[PDB]
Design a protein around this nucleic acid. Sequence first.
RNA 1: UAAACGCUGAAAGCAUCUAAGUGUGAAACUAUCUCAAAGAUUAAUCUUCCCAUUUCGCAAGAAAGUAAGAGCCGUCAAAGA
RNA 2: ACCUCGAUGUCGACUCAUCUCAUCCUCGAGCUGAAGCAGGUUCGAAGGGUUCGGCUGUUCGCCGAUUAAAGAGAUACGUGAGUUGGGUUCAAACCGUCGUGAGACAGGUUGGUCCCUAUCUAUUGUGCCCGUAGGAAGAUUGAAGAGUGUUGCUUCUAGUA
RNA 3: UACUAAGUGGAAAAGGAUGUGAAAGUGCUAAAACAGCAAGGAUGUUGGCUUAGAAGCAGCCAUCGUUUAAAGAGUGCGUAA
Lengths: 122, 176, 231, 37
Amino acid sequence: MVSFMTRLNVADNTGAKQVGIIKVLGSTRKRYAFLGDVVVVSVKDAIPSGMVKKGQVLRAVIVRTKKGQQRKDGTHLKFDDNACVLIKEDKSPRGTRIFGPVARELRERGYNKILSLAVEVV
Amino acid sequence: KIGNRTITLDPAKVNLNFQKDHIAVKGPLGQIELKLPPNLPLKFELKDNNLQITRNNELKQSKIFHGTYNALITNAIIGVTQGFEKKLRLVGVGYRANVEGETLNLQLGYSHPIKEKIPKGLTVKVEKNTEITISGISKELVGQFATEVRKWRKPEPYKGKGVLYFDEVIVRKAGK
Amino acid sequence: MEIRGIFGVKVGMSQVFTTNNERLPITVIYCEPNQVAGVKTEAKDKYSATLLSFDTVENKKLNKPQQGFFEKNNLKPTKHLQEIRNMTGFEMGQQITPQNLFQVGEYVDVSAISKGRGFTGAIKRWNFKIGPLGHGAGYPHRFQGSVQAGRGGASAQRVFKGKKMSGHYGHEKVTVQNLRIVGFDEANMLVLVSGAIAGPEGGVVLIRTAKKKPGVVKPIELAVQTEKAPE
Amino acid sequence: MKVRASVKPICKDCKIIKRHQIVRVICKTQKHKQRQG
RNA sequence: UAAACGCUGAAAGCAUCUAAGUGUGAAACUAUCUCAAAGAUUAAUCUUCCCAUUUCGCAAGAAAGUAAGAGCCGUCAAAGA
RNA sequence: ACCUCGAUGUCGACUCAUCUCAUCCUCGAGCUGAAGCAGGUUCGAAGGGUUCGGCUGUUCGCCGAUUAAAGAGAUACGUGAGUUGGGUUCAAACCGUCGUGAGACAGGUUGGUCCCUAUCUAUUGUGCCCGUAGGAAGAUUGAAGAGUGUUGCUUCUAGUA
RNA sequence: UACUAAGUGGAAAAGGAUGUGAAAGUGCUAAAACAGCAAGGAUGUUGGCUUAGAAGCAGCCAUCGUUUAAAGAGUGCGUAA
Ligand SMILES: [K+]
Ligand SMILES: [Mg+2]
Ligand SMILES: [Mg+2]
Ligand SMILES: [Mg+2]
Ligand SMILES: [Mg+2]
Ligand SMILES: [Mg+2]
Ligand SMILES: [Mg+2]
Ligand SMILES: [Mg+2]
Ligand SMILES: [Mg+2]
Ligand SMILES: [Mg+2]
Ligand SMILES: [Mg+2]
Ligand SMILES: [Mg+2]
Ligand SMILES: [Mg+2]
Ligand SMILES: [Mg+2]
Ligand SMILES: [Mg+2]
Ligand SMILES: [Mg+2]
Ligand SMILES: [Mg+2]
Ligand SMILES: [Mg+2]
Ligand SMILES: [Mg+2]
Ligand SMILES: [Mg+2]
Ligand SMILES: [Mg+2]
Ligand SMILES: [Mg+2]
Ligand SMILES: [Mg+2]
Ligand SMILES: [Mg+2]
Ligand SMILES: [Mg+2]
Ligand SMILES: [Mg+2]
Ligand SMILES: [Mg+2]
Ligand SMILES: [Mg+2]
Ligand SMILES: [Mg+2]
Ligand SMILES: [Mg+2]
Ligand SMILES: [Mg+2]
Ligand SMILES: [Mg+2]
Ligand SMILES: [Zn+2]
């Protein structure tokens, strides 16, 4: 459960190594962000050959969580690191590839482009 | 004045039974019943083909009742003898209505289907999909039906869309 | 309205997998056949209700007035007696089981006495906030919250009736609504109810028709395992 | 409808009435409806 | 029912939601939902069970003499300072 | 300058909130220089809700990102026999300025003791006694009450009016 | 014996209103009153400057005259007019 001012990794090719959460988008006092949730973030660790620059405020969607969440059948999906990918208004990824595995909760909330550009969905 | 206005009625078919507080009028159409509130400050007299309402005092409510019930007797006789009718011009792009049994259904612009139950004694006919005629023997009842049908789509001032009344003009506005 | 009620004892909680791929936690209720001990009519009493008898026990474990009533009404001796409002249509001295009352998957509500917790504080009882722990602090850390309404003759100068402070918590009747029945077990006289039921295991439980959704019955069916013998 | 402490006819067609023990002004033009006289 | 809109209708032959009569109308109000509740002294209702002695005199009197039930004590916890 | 100088602890923050309506959102309606969408103004309405941060002791305020909304006030500018003491205002020290001086400044800065076991009443819970007119064990009706009431997004209706 | 219909009485101003009672005058009226209903409601002409244009209803030059019961360089709406 990624919360306010949480540093997390980016699983895409965009030049951003460390990203910090600013707001858990969606409602008032939305405490946590689970898999598939959209957040507003700020790039804090970037690279010279990157599309984004350090300090930009952008919108991202989370794909992995260390805490994890439980599905309806009873299966508990749990990763080992919190990861998010940078998205555009249209809900389309900013990067051209997605690194590592992603959850299935993206499929429910649209995000079809994210699934098709992933390595393997879980 | 309405109170001192003749109510000349032919005895061909219209009789008016005057009880203590229950006036019954019977004629060509159905019978109309009027309730008299207690301690009514106005006495009727029933001569040949002429009814005259007189009062006892010069009170404000006495005068008000004398006029009001003269009008009510006039309206009851007219409705019993020839009835009342109202005409609604339902106009629009896809507006249409028709009658199934006791319920009049309309499809103006609403996702949910619109139906309306017809009370007793009133007959509503739809000769053309854009036209509605409500015929009855009580003026207030046909008026209530006309206005409650209207409430679904009140005539807008920008175009002609709505459930208009017949020979009713609306102020036009030009929404560029 | 047409309210149906039955009494049972909660035995525990388990889970069942269902078609449409859901894992549903369930509560298991042991429901003895209930006996209608009295019927009270609207005309003769000014209200209508049905009082049943359940949790049967031997005659030597019952007091003299109650056993006299049971032998006068020609009923099976039971130590528990309770009624439900607006329950009509049952003849006196008829055994009632939940199979005849509710459907396979209809909505019901369940009332039970909550688990006793004793003398609890304001935070555990009224979901209050705890005071700061660092940056300097004081003796009251788990503070209830200032109960000042007004200081001075022109103001209340009193704690308002119904204030939120520490006190007894638990051992109180509570109702959870819109619980779907999952399965009936006639041989073991065992009812399966989705969700969680209040009260300790072995306590009494009242199952009633839900007032929010009286006639609504949402279908639910279990899954049949396709696994076969090892090859 | 315009709520004012003082109500007076605006055009010669405006007519003052007293409904529900409150004086109002009604007229063909709906911009001239007044209340709370 | 509030704001608002009415139908039929006069005082004031017209008009007019109002004075009589008859409607529509909000998360507000009264109920529907949950909990507690006859110390509600205005102390309610129903069902079941147990009392219905011998003498003296004094009767919501005495001496003894008659039951349902409850409590003390013990083992406890679905409870609990 | 009427109460209080044989003592009424004074800013801000934390916890708990309650009340008013001159209504920020949600709810209903009239007018519009209201085509639709989104608005403006007025009327009715207090049931619920009314965010997190950066700088400052701060209230205030500016800025950032959200939200349906980030309302105006009162309650000793609510609340220290509930917490804190950052600020003000003890003794220490320095800067600028005034004074010949000791010293002084709603000028600035560093540091600096916040006590009380609850008698009455108010309140949250739990008991004993007695009454309810024979006693006891059960099941009830419900006079007077308390608790909750927030709302968003997507799809369809329909790219229809 | 009158008045009030507001619980006014039982707190308030500038201002607003066909609430109601009393009084004192004045106009018309059964040679017909007022409202409403049914008819007409004019001609030069659409006068002229003026204005892109106004000419019954822009500012004007003013604010015409006949027929006739009546009629206005118009009562508004409204039309580029
Ligand atoms: K003092
Ligand atoms: Mg200390
Ligand atoms: Mg401590
Ligand atoms: Mg006082
Ligand atoms: Mg006081
Ligand atoms: Mg009318
Ligand atoms: Mg109603
Ligand atoms: Mg007494
Ligand atoms: Mg003095
Ligand atoms: Mg004082
Ligand atoms: Mg003293
Ligand atoms: Mg003191
Ligand atoms: Mg003190
Ligand atoms: Mg208001
Ligand atoms: Mg309510
Ligand atoms: Mg910092
Ligand atoms: Mg003050
Ligand atoms: Mg204060
Ligand atoms: Mg304050
Ligand atoms: Mg001050
Ligand atoms: Mg205090
Ligand atoms: Mg304090
Ligand atoms: Mg202290
Ligand atoms: Mg004190
Ligand atoms: Mg300090
Ligand atoms: Mg310190
Ligand atoms: Mg010093
Ligand atoms: Mg010097
Ligand atoms: Mg009481
Ligand atoms: Mg008063
Ligand atoms: Mg007046
Ligand atoms: Mg007068
Ligand atoms: Zn007007």
